Subunit: 156 residues, 10 copies
Amino acid sequence: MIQSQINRNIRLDLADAILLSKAKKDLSFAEIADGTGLAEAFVTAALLGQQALPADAARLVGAKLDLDEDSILLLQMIPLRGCIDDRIPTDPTMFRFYEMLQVYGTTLKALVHEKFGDGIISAINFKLDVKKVADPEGGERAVITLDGKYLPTKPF
Amino acid sequence: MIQSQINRNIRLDLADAILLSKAKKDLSFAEIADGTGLAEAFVTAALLGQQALPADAARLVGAKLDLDEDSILLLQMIPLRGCIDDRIPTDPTMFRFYEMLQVYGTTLKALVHEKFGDGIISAINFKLDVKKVADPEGGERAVITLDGKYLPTKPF
Amino acid sequence: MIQSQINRNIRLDLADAILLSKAKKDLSFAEIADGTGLAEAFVTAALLGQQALPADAARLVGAKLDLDEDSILLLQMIPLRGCIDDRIPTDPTMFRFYEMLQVYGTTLKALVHEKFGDGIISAINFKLDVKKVADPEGGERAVITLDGKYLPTKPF
Amino acid sequence: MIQSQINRNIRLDLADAILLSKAKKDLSFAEIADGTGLAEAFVTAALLGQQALPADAARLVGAKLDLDEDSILLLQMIPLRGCIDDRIPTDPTMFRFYEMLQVYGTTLKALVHEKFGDGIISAINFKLDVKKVADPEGGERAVITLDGKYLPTKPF
Amino acid sequence: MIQSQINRNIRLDLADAILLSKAKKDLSFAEIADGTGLAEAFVTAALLGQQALPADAARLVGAKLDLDEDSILLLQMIPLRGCIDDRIPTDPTMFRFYEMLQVYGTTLKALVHEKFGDGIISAINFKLDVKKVADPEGGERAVITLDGKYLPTKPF
Amino acid sequence: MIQSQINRNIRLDLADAILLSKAKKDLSFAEIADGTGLAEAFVTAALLGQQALPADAARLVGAKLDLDEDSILLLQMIPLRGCIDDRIPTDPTMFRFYEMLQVYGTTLKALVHEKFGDGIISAINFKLDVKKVADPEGGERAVITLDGKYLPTKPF
Amino acid sequence: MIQSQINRNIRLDLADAILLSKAKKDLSFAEIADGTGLAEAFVTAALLGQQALPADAARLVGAKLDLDEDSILLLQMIPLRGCIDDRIPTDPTMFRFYEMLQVYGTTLKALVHEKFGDGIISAINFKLDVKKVADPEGGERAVITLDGKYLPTKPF
Amino acid sequence: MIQSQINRNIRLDLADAILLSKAKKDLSFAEIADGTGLAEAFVTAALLGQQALPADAARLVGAKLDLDEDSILLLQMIPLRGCIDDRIPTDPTMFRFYEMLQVYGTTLKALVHEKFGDGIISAINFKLDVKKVADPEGGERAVITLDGKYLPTKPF
Amino acid sequence: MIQSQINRNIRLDLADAILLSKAKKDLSFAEIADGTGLAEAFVTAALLGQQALPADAARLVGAKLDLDEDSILLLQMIPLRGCIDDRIPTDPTMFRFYEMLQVYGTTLKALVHEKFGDGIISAINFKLDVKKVADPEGGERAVITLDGKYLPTKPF
Amino acid sequence: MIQSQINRNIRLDLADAILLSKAKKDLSFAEIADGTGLAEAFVTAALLGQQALPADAARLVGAKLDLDEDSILLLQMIPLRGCIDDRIPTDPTMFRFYEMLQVYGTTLKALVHEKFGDGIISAINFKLDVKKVADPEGGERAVITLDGKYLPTKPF
Ligand SMILES: O=C([O-])C(=O)[O-]
Ligand SMILES: O=C([O-])C(=O)[O-]
Ligand SMILES: O=C([O-])C(=O)[O-]
Ligand SMILES: O=C([O-])C(=O)[O-]
Ligand SMILES: O=C([O-])C(=O)[O-]
């Protein structure tokens, strides 16, 4: 039977414990996700309290991280989502993503309406991924692809 | 000589006037940007107060929208950026992007550090674009590509 | 060509002007919406800056309210939505709906997950209506129906 | 003698304990409410810290969840209600209900005044329920019914 | 037909204009409410944007204050209520009432539940009045009487 | 020697322990205050962290509730007052008193100045009480009397 | 008949006009208050929207500053007090006084209770003054005297 | 070697411990400061986490209060200052000093600039003291003296 | 006679007008400050509402910018300082300086206490300058020098 | 394998423990950083939770402070940065740096755009240092040097 959380702190505390274990075992997110059949972004978000793992996957990562039974069970709960501590990120790495919205949020709205119509790009029927690409001018770039379903707003 | 703004409301008020003129003329952002040599995302962000147009681009869009000289000048000023009224968008369309961060913000941090290292993905050495594509399951999707330079954090 | 707003105050100021004309003509929202082919809640939300009217509906309500051409065009724009002035309503009538969420928000989450699964009830693929009904014990009740599509959150 | 709480964290900590026991026993909210004679939304809200259980219901759910005597006692206390952590939900599922108010809040006020008169729809003489209905286009919908008494505001 | 507002500033702007006219004519709230058949507290609240006046009361105060037709119409609209500028009063006089709640709010909760049961004392089925009384120790006291209906919270 | 607190959580934690003891013993606030010679509103406020009890009353209530010596000492400390968790109550029962201020705050200011003059109604030279009165139309009402000294603001 | 304000912006806008007139006439606060019979801190507070002038003083300062009749009348209104724009001062000069409270606020509470008892030092039965005094080590110091009546909190 | 804190909670938790010890021993702040050579306001502020004691004073108060070695060491650390829990005091006693600034903050700015010039009155080169004195009209008053160095703002 | 402001918007509105004129005239901040004898950071801050110009400098810049007499007078007023619209900058350029404090703020405190002792580095007896320096690895760097007086916090 | 944190409190709690050990050993930050090959500002920032130490440095500071293995491991994790408890510092020493931005933030933006162009001064390709030097007029000054790469914002 599906089970859900209402207080984000239970899974975020579990995330901190997972990260300590992960660091002690010197493991990567890539290798933790390897073998689950699930995308690295999904598995990672789950460890970090923002997705639910199916049972087999929760047992697999729970074996790798030496997690107890309650922790393996918690990983299967649908989370009370929300990773930002207080609305605006304090961390530079997370903040740059918020700033992309402060600069382009209205442009995103305008071009979404122009290309699709009234409505939204979904954050639910949605996936993201992060790719590393060489910068021709030197160095590296991240290409983060946000891929969401258009849901129209129609008169009724 | 470069010129800069310190109060966002000047350019945001100009944006509202631009949008009224744009509606009266039944124009698209695509056609406004046409002939500028500049990406639709960039030109649109400028009209909306979040970027500066070069002089030639400003004259061009100014002619399309019947803008007075002061307005054309304002479009060239470096803006006081920040499109979100009060930190968290109230608009559903803009809000979904913020929600992508509430769900995936810590994952983005985690995978950026794993893939690149300590540091950030830049919001300055940076571009984005919006594409519409059919969903293989029926309907349409937006593919929003965020493309930023990795800047390392190193000890000193 | 679809046209969209980025600052809510343009449409909200128009709403105030609409309400004054509505009051001077002694009109109801029901009679304003009648003949548009559209639900009273949708048309009312449009007048109040939270939905866009199709052209014929905008011309029709604009005739009943004696709106100028700019106002009729503004009603056709996709709005920057958000009717609450500062996150928490001050008005008792609006506030009660917020309180229903303070009391039942977590129950709605829990029961949605149990009945449907992980994911959300859409506020986009969505309609609302307000029905007045006699209370069997005396007096009257409102039955407000929230009717939204279930969108699953699935692993990937 | 009736007993009441003044700090929501006591009952919210209890709710977290209850959800862990519920998950360990693989129980549903429907099974837990069944036999109490109380609506599932009402029982669920109580477990989650937002309603008080009568003594017999508290003993019945307490037995099902293997709760101690203090926990069964706490369930009978009148709570310090307020399920949202910090005013605006972070969780997408709960958030959608808040957005329905950001879009339709002023429409609800407007139509409530037109249909009933000055005053409010109560959040106290009030019930809600969640029903799953098939979407004729495919998929599922939730119909959430908010059913509240009208209380008039009258001159004095 | 009843008419309602959605932006408090329209009626609060009218209140400022009313207060200037009131001062120029050197009138009291007591005189203004006289003849209206309505309590001073209710008529005063309406002038200040927090209640609606019936049409005859509106015309009567409007004649006293020399108000134009749009102002007398505005006074009959159901207001978007909320007199506190930003949640916590800055004014000492108003602030003391807020501080009575900071000190006794949990006591009021506790004693309401003990005396009446779960539920609330209404702010809608409700009246207030202010009386001046001599203090036996010297000086004057305000006796402010809050009088609201108990509405029970019952299981269902 | 008088002793005072600077962090509300010490006394608020004690309040929660008091409420659990109170509930285990199935006591009322009326019976707790009985024999102290002090008003129920004052004694209740002290238990809930918002007043100090004189030593004799502290020992009396401490006996009834089986409190340890440090708890009885804590009850005699002058508190760091402030019962509302985060400025605006979340609990419906407490909230209604805040709404009475959102609706009538400016009327209270206006009528206080008119009846008494510039200055305030004190929240210090002050008492409150709660009475239950039958409603002639059916049901029950609370009459809450706020009774404060007028302190004038005078030029100097 | 006494008159009162409910929106601080009316007297704050008048303050800005007063300051521009004062600057044009190159006047000081000391010379504006001289001849009024009223303390410089009281007169200055009135000009700046935080106190009400008696009629003669209002006319006297109105003549010095060349104010119109509505402005002279406004100065006589009891203000909606609150000089800080948004809770915490942005201006360094005002900020230092807030910082004195962030450092010494709990010490002020502790020593007030120790010296006087439970209760407060009044902000109403209160005066302040600003004196300049040579610093023996060189330079100048301000001695700002806050002088308030003790009001006790007593059991009832 | 000087040592400094970065999280106020460590010293604020110590302040609570000190206050409990102080109450158990029935001590005054005046007695605690006696023999230190230091003003009661400075020593009290240190106990409450807002100042650092020199080693000899820390040992002396530590002996009076039976503090352990870690606590005596903590008292010598330079604090992360800030005694107000969340910007605006909830406590009536502390709040009145904040209200003094809401009423007189702009007057203090204005008169400081007139008497001294552009710049500030220091909160660092600064002392404060609290005196109790009889009110000639009956009762008691606090004279709180804020004594700070004028630091000019000069062009450069 | 020195003159001061109490509402930042008067000078910030002047700043926007200054910036439009500066742009129409294609002027740099460097050339506006040239001839004034004042550092470019100081003159620029004054234009932007954060410092006062001496009379001669105000007339000089007034001449270059074609400002009216009221504007030149306004420039000489001591401002109500605070350039950030709402606590945290929205603009990326400004925001990076805030982030420097989010990363190094506690290190600044720690190292100031270690090097100088308890107290502060002044923001009043203070100057700042901005230099452009070539980056040995290519491109350009800003070296921004913050230079402030240490004021000690000593016992008294 | 690189490891990262998502909740600042883990490393901030570690910082408090580090600071206690540091004080018990009477160490300076200069002495701690000595032998590490890294700048005092960088190593201090890491101890305080705002940078990551390379393994050799972590083991070395770990030996000096007698940290356990988990603690040495934690110091090598990439932090969730953000040292300011709640947006605006409460501590005077940290606050002065924030004030420097309230006074000069728009000047920094203006002069950066003039000297470099549209874009930013990086907080990532960035270093700072704190120097103590005598003030020619007596006393001591801090020279804090902010040194960041210019990254341009260019059309695309
Ligand atoms: O965002 C950036 O690119 C930065 O701060 O360096
Ligand atoms: O985000 C969504 O997909 C929605 O609300 O329908
Ligand atoms: O919500 C209610 O029912 C009320 O306030 O009367
Ligand atoms: O509330 C009060 O009584 C005061 O401030 O004087
Ligand atoms: O407050 C002070 O003394 C300062 O910042 O210079």
